Amino acid sequence: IVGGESALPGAWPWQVSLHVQNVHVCGGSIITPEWIVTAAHCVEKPLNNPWHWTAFAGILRQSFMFYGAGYQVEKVISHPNYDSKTKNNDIALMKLQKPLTFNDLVKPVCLPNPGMMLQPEQLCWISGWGATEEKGKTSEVLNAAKVLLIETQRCNSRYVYDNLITPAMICAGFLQGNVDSCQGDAGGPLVTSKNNIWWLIGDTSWGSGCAKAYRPGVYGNVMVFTDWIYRQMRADGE
Amino acid sequence: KCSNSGIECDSSGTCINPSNWCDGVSHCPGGEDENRCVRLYGPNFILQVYSSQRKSWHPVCQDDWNENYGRAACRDMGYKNNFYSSQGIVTSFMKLNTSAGNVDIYKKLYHSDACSSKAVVSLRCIACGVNLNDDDDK
Amino acid sequence: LPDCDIDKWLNNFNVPSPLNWERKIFSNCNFNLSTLLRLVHTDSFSCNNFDESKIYGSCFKSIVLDKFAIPNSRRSDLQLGSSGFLQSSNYKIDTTSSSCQLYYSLPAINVTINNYNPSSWNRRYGFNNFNLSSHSVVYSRYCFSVNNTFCPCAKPSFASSCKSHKPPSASCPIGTNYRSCESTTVLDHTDWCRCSCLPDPITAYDPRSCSQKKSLVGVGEHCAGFGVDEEKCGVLDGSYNVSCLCSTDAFLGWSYDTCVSNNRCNIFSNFILNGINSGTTCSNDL
Ligand SMILES: *[C@@H]1O[C@H](CO)[C@@H](O)[C@H](O)[C@H]1NC(C)=O
Ligand SMILES: *[C@@H]1O[C@H](CO)[C@@H](O)[C@H](O)[C@H]1NC(C)=O
Ligand SMILES: *[C@@H]1O[C@H](CO)[C@@H](O)[C@H](O)[C@H]1NC(C)=O
Ligand SMILES: [Ca+2]
Numbered sequence: 001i002v003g004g005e006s007a008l009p010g011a012w013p014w015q016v017s018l019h020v021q022n023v024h025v026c027g028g029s030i031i032t033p034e035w036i037v038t039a040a041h042c043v044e045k046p047l048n049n050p051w052h053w054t055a056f057a058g059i060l061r062q063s064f065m066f067y068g069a070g071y072q073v074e075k076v077i078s079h080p081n082y083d084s085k086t087k088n089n090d091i092a093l094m095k096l097q098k099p100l101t102f103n104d105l106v107k108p109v110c111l112p113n114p115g116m117m118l119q120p121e122q123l124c125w126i127s128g129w130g131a132t133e134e135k136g137k138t139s140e141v142l143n144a145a146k147v148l149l150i151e152t153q154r155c156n157s158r159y160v161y162d163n164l165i166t167p168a169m170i171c172a173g174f175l176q177g178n179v180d181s182c183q184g185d186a187g188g189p190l191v192t193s194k195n196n197i198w199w200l201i202g203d204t205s206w207g208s209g210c211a212k213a214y215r216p217g218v219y220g221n222v223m224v225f226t227d228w229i230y231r232q233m234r235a236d237g238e
Numbered sequence: 239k240c241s242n243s244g245i246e247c248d249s250s251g252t253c254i255n256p257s258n259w260c261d262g263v264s265h266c267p268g269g270e271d272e273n274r275c276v277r278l279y280g281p282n283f284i285l286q287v288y289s290s291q292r293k294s295w296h297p298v299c300q301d302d303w304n305e306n307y308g309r310a311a312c313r314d315m316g317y318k319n320n321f322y323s324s325q326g327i328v329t330s331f332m333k334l335n336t337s338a339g340n341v342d343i344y345k346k347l348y349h350s351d352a353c354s355s356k357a358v359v360s361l362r363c364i365a366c367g368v369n370l371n372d373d374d375d376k
Numbered sequence: 377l378p379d380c381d382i383d384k385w386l387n388n389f390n391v392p393s394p395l396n397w398e399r400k401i402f403s404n405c406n407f408n409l410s411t412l413l414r415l416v417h418t419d420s421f422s423c424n425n426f427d428e429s430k431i432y433g434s435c436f437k438s439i440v441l442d443k444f445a446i447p448n449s450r451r452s453d454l455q456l457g458s459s460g461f462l463q464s465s466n467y468k469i470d471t472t473s474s475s476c477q478l479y480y481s482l483p484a485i486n487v488t489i490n491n492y493n494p495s496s497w498n499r500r501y502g503f504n505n506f507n508l509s510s511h512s513v514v515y516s517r518y519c520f521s522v523n524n525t526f527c528p529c530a531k532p533s534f535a536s537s538c539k540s541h542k543p544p545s546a547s548c549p550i551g552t553n554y555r556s557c558e559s560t561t562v563l564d565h566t567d568w569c570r571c572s573c574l575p576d577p578i579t580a581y582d583p584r585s586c587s588q589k590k591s592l593v594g595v596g597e598h599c600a601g602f603g604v605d606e607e608k609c610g611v612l613d614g615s616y617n618v619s620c621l622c623s624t625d626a627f628l629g630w631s632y633d634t635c636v637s638n639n640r641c642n643i644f645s646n647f648i649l650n651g652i653n654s655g656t657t658c659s660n661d662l
Pocket of ligand 3: 522523525589
């Protein structure tokens with residue numbers, strides 16, 4: 001995260017660090033004791049083998065993420081309409097082999113419902129262990145920052161992203177920059193507060209640079225992917 | 239992709255009749271027509287069920303509604319045995335046919351015009367959305 | 377018609393530790409809440425997902441009672457949603473049900489703490505009792521589970537072929553696999569043996585080789601068992617003539633602390649309210 005501050009324990013209990021070969025690569029968001037929402041570009045082949053992924057919950061520092069403190073990922077499900085060139089439908093689910101234990105440090109975030117009636121520039125939060133500056137290294141501590149929703153019509157302007165933002169994507173951040181997700185935040189949560197409840201409205205997807213002017217962050221529209229998520233969890237219960 | 243043909247199954251553009259959506263029998267190739275028939279609406283978690291006779295979403299009457307029915311709606315949405323809260327809350331509705339048998343949950347309800355309890359069903363299938371309550375700084 | 381007598385069960389001088397917490401289901405009886413809090417030396421009584429004033433003059437299907445003594449240094453762990461040792465490794469408080477938490481105490485002079493390891497596989501391989509001072513209360517910091525095929529001793533035939541880092545060995549019970557070891561060579565050093573769960577299952581560099589798996593307790597569950605240092609199960613050059621047995625100090629990840637403050641042992645109790653306004657567990661407070 002560029003432009004954020006260090007996060008406290010329990011501030012973001014759904015945030016998880018996803019390690020491939022015990023190195024942090026992407027973030028995720030807990031929705032059920034055994035399901036985690038993340039980005040599909042994080043798990044492109046050959047990184048689709050669920051045996052390679054371990055998830056760390058409730059831990060705020062990367063050096064405290066010893067092997068064995070993480071949970072073994074059992075299954076990885078990329079969106080079947082995911083396009084790697086346009087980053088369209090950049091959403092993926094991960095199932096844990098053993099369910100988490102919820103407490104003040106590990107809690108799920110609510111999946112969004114239809115008719116949320118969000119504001120055009122609704123105040124949101126992003127979080128993750130991504131770099132704090134462009135072309136930086138994975139941050140040690142969990143960071144979080146305030147971003148505002150950017151109307152897709154404005155984000156699709158010829159001066160921002162020329163009709164590259166699809167209905168499966170939403171924009172957040174600032175058209176002046178300074179605050180944005182970055183390298184290592186992919187799959188991380190984009191959450192807002194309404195009715196005293198935190199909702200997962202986006203997963204960190206793509207963008208041009210980090211916190212640059214006219215280049216806000218693009219996130220997967222989790223509301224659009226809501227039907228697909230429910231269908232996947234419904235099938236695993238079997 | 240199914241405007242002049244029906245409702246898109248999302249199974250590579252296959253279309254079926256809107257009357258066959260959430261009608262109990264699986265027509266779509268992947269059953270997409272019979273697995274997303276129950277949802278939660280708005281920031282107040284208003285329980286809704288898609289009716290096939292009317293081809294639209296409608297809230298649920300609190301008449302004879304209990305916890306087991308809410309857990310059956312949560313299993314239908316993919317939350318498995320998870321359940322958190324359920325209560326009544328303040329025009330086409332879905333009254334609850336008690337003698338419906340061992341049928342899908344969204345079929346245990348029939349369309350009506352009013353609920354005798356005056357309240358619709360609010361449902362939360364999992365305890366989520368709670369974090370650190372920040373500070374008291376002005 | 378009969379009396380619940382909850383106060384007598386809560387005032388029994390044989391108090392368990394959080395490791396071996398006890399449970400009593402109260403059903404089909406009549407209870408007086410106001411006299412209950414009087415007969416027990418109540419310190420605090422709050423409720424979660426339930427308001428206390430609606431217990432007086434109400435019927436429930438059953439009232440489930442869990443209780444255990446409180447290690448003084450671990451009182452903060454009993455806060456709802458705490459990630460402390462008590463709820464991670466001994467008793468996880470159900471935060472979803474309608475519950476009530478009761479803190480009270482008994483005279484220390486008459487209280488005998490019952491520290492008992494509930495792990496079946498811990499007792500199978502050497503663990504007998506905690507020989508601790510009076511009023512000391514055992515709590516686990518980490519729990520580990522194993523399959524039925526578990527055994528912590530390396531095979532005597534394997535150990536005999538170790539030129540370096542020879543593991544202790546003994547015979548394992550029938551139906552249990554031996555400790556997974558491996559004869560390895562590095563540089564010119566040959567028969568350098570490498571076994572699992574090293575240095576110990578708590579700080580294991582590779583937890584995937586250790587058959588002992590970390591496990592947090594869930595609601596209604598007990599501790600799966602203390603992790604065992606497998607380098608202390610069996611003896612060096614032990615034969616098949618020696619049964620696999622771990623020493624007392626091979627069991628790790630547990631501590632203890634007294635419950636006595638102001639000459640009284642502090643006790644925790646969790647109430648579970650099942651089926652409000654339904655059942656035959658009625659209140660006589662009205
Ligand atoms: C309830 O369902 C049963 C079983 O199909 C049916 O016979 C009955 O007519 C239904 N009642 C109403 C009021 O819909
Ligand atoms: C506690 O022990 C003392 C001394 O052994 C005994 O006199 C006393 O009666 C006991 N307390 C109770 C409540 O029985
Ligand atoms: C032992 O338990 C582990 C837990 O990870 C499980 O994978 C395995 O199938 C069980 N059985 C054996 C024989 O290892
Ligand atoms: Ca159908």
